[PDB]
Symmetry: C2
Subunit: 363 residues, 2 copies
């Protein structure tokens, strides 16, 4: 087309950090074409208290009055079932996010995905409250010499039995395999949802980032800016991710995992911080893929309908009724995104032409 | 043991660069325990002329009077059969190194490995002069949308048909698949050498680096200091390289691919230079592998006997008869190696303890 009404757009995997970085990035949610954002909890320290999660959103809302913020707790032994019920009651959180220990940013204070039993009381409460369980689905890497090797290329596949058990022990709970990167994970999600037909049946879904629809291992091998977790994988994996994203199936929907880092935390000779920054042009990135796939008819489901449906986003929570309007005027992605002070971020696909822009119209 | 006499040690894959970097690194050849070095030609601009290869060697000999230097040309369209004959007849080179275009440091002037026949007059002259054809055996990446894609993980496997065709078309030409990184390559070299046992029968050999005996993809994913070409691959590949290095087979011998870069060329958000710096502790790094594999009796073959046999190094070429003595004194690898002025290099396994040290015995 040349103008597409995406309605209330949906980015269900957002990192905005804190401090000067957050002031720079949260207004970019709306700027990249996103009305509703699900905010991830891996701050330093993690978000595990009620007052933190409440004030964090107030800080966010002040920065972005027209952005709807859905919040989350960082899965943790700190949490209690009481904190869960007390938070779902006051509608302070809409889900809880699990980070396996060591596999990504600010995950050191994370959990071990081999003994999930210690958190079954937490999922117990979460299920009763219809809260979402978000999973960074990678097993930690394993050296040893006895048990089968786990590395960055198969850590997501090795996590897939854990996902299935969690689904089989909490069958009413809403679970999301965040940012899928492998054909194996796509196939697992499609099998778990084999008998779904419309749509509110889905209880296990997967988010797909913008960058994993573009990247393979070649793009990050000598390019830390394209390094994130889970890493982009083989060409066959990308094909499956793209096919899923444009499939029109209600169990795949957009989650950017926009993960902002100052440029000096990417230009390291060791300990490069994982993460791609896509917030500034979130929807235009996804538009490009759907255009090239001749499937622009499925864009609205992927970037709006399916996440709204799965998260059950009701009209009474949306901060602004403005519609996101995609229109086919080319823009150039800048080389850097700066706050004029101490923050420079390199955006995903810095310097590239995008065919689409996005603006806001009232309902 | 305590103390092992390795004799005249060989590193048949050495980068020493130019200028201040070369003044820092070439004395480290001896320091890391290596008597004989095969000097790669991927300078800027590459070594493709007789005068430059002779002048380079003089520089190197002045920096390191006890080190034996074997030189090479960079395979390029500027080379002619007359020049091959002239360089051979002047004892100015021992081989010619092929870089497929785009796959590694200073390879933009390299070749198209789907059009090797354009270089058959060169190989013919090399065969007649008993020179060595060294191959950086990786196919350039093709992501394509046509036939099966090439990426950094399979680029070496994708190159193996070209190696077999070269050996089949020039059966008397000595060919080295440099720095093997994949089990598939190991199997291909073993199969080409099916009916060899000792040693002058070997026509196609492979070098193995120090770092590929330690590294997997998990070690460089977020660590540019460990990023090299060909990239370190899966646990199963590393296992097969280690087993090859301690094999005692005459068609595997040591080539460090020590590839020094200043620290600022590693700490980049894009365009990280490929290369691991291992020269300063080359022999001790290998000793650690052979000790852990209960294979110390095979060490002298892998790091001395087999390279000398394959390159036919004669006692009249040797710059010093000093013998390398490995002795089991602990040492720690520094965090950084500097010339005191503008160059800092991060060495392989910076900060780790090694069990062995190497010294020189005059003979
Ligand atoms: Zn994640
Ligand atoms: Zn994330
Ligand atoms: Zn190479
Ligand atoms: Zn090399």
């Amino acid at each position: 087309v040349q103008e597409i009404d995406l309605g209330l757009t949906c980015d269900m995997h957002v990192h905005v950090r804190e401090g000067a970085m957050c002031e720079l990035v949260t207004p970019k949610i709306r700027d990249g074409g996103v009305s509703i954002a699900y905010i991830m909890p891996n701050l330093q320290p993690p978000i595990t208290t009620l007052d933190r999660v409440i004030e964090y959103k107030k800080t966010l809302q002040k920065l972005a009055p027209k952005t709807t913020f859905l919040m989350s707790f960082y899965l943790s032994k700190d949490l209690t079932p009481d904190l869960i019920h007390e938070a779902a009651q006051q509608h302070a959180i809409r889900g809880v996010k699990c980070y396996p220990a060591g596999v990504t940013t600010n995950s050191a204070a994370g959990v071990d995905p081999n003994d999930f039993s210690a958190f079954y009381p937490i999922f117990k409460a979460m299920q009763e409250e219809n809260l979402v369980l978000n999973l960074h689905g990678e097993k930690p890497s394993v050296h040893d010499g006895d048990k089968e090797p786990i590395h960055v290329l198969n850590a997501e596949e090795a996590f897939l039995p854990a996902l299935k058990k969690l689904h089989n022990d909490f069958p009413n709970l809403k679970i999301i395999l965040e940012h899928c990167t492998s054909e194996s994970a796509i196939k697992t999600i499609e099998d778990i949802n084999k008998n779904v037909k419309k749509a509110t049946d889905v209880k296990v879904a997967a988010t797909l980032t913008a960058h994993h629809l573009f990247l393979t291992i070649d793009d990050w091998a000598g390019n830390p800016v394209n390094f994130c977790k889970p890493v982009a994988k083989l060409p066959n994996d990308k094909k499956a991710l793209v096919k899923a994203a444009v499939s029109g199936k209600p169990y795949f929907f957009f989650g950017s995992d926009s993960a902002p880092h100052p440029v000096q935390n990417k230009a390291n000779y060791e300990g490069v911080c994982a993460g791609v920054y896509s917030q500034s042009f979130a929807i235009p990135y996804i538009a490009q893929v759907f255009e090239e796939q001749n499937a622009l008819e499925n864009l609205k489901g992927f970037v709006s309908d399916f996440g709204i449906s799965f998260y059950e986003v009701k009209d009474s929570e949306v901060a602004s009724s403005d519609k996101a309007i995609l229109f086919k005027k080319e823009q150039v992605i800048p080389q850097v995104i700066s706050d004029g002070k101490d923050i420079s971020i390199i955006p995903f696909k810095a310097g590239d032409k995008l065919s689409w822009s996005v603006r806001w119209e009232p309902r």
